[PDB]
Amino acid sequence: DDEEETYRLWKIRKTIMQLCHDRGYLVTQDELDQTLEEFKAQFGDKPSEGRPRRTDLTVLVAHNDDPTDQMFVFFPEEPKVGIKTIKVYCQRMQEENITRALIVVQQGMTPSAKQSLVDMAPKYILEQFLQQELLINITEHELVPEHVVMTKEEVTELLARYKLRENQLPRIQAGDPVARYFGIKRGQVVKIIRPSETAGRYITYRLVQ
DNA sequence: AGTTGATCTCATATGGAGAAGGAGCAGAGCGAATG
Numbered sequence: 001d002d003e004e005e006t007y008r009l010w011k012i013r014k015t016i017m018q019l020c021h022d023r024g025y026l027v028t029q030d031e032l033d034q035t036l037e038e039f040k041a042q043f044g045d046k047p048s049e050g051r052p053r054r055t056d057l058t059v060l061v062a063h064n065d066d067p068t069d070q071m072f073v074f075f076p077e078e079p080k081v082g083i084k085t086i087k088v089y090c091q092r093m094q095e096e097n098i099t100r101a102l103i104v105v106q107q108g109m110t111p112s113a114k115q116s117l118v119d120m121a122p123k124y125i126l127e128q129f130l131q132q133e134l135l136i137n138i139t140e141h142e143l144v145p146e147h148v149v150m151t152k153e154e155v156t157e158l159l160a161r162y163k164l165r166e167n168q169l170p171r172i173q174a175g176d177p178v179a180r181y182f183g184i185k186r187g188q189v190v191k192i193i194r195p196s197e198t199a200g201r202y203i204t205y206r207l208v209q
Numbered sequence: 210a211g212t213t214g215a216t217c218t219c220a221t222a223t224g225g226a227g228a229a230g231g232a233g234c235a236g237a238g239c240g241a242a243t244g
Contacts, residue, residue, distance in 0.1 A: 082237070110237060 025061035072101035145194035172206035
């Protein structure tokens with residue numbers, strides 16, 4: 001029971017570190033490859049005993065390109081997170097001056113909390129993940145090809161090369177599992193590199209909608 | 210400027226699949242009123 005919850009927490013942490021590394025936040029190799037017994041050593045083996053508390057699991061990371069661009073990962077203790085908890089995180093983000101955070105929720109989020117993530121979105125970007133959808137890194141699955149988020153300059157070069165408008169690219173939904181993983185917003189473009197049985201390799205581009 | 214006549218026209222008699230709307234209803238959370 002605690003042997004199950006500690007395994008879940010470890011897997012979720014591993015996936016979150018992989019996600020942060022793929023978003024380009026500075027993540028050490030040691031924490032990226034931390035084993036289950038090392039997790040038990042650092043945080044504990046009886047989360048029902050409060051060892052760890054899920055408040056202990058919180059992560060803070062900084063971007064490789066700018067040490068002031070920082071992101072939290074929060075693991076709320078309550079199963080169904082309400083607006084009180086979002087307000088607590090908003091306060092903590094305001095005082096630490098952190099604009100991005102991921103909120104990992106065990107069972108869900110209340111309608112009011114969902115709307116509160118929308119209504120603060122320009123200044124503080126809060127994202128919801130279920131813990132279930134973090135128990136496996138979907139980008140390691142064999143059906144999912146390599147996704148690379150493009151820079152604005154690279155999109156301008158793309159559109160200038162093929163002489164096309166953004167609306168002529170094929171789309172990806174902002175709610176797509178992989179778009180959510182990379183955290184890409186409307187109007188960004190993701191380069192996709194996939195093998196092909198007739199050319200050898202093929203690149204395609206999707207505009208987020 | 211005045212006169213004729215066809216002709217029209219009224220009126221008389223006796224399977225299934227997906228999508229969309231509504232009601233039920235649970236329950237979040239806001240604000241007033243305590244106690």
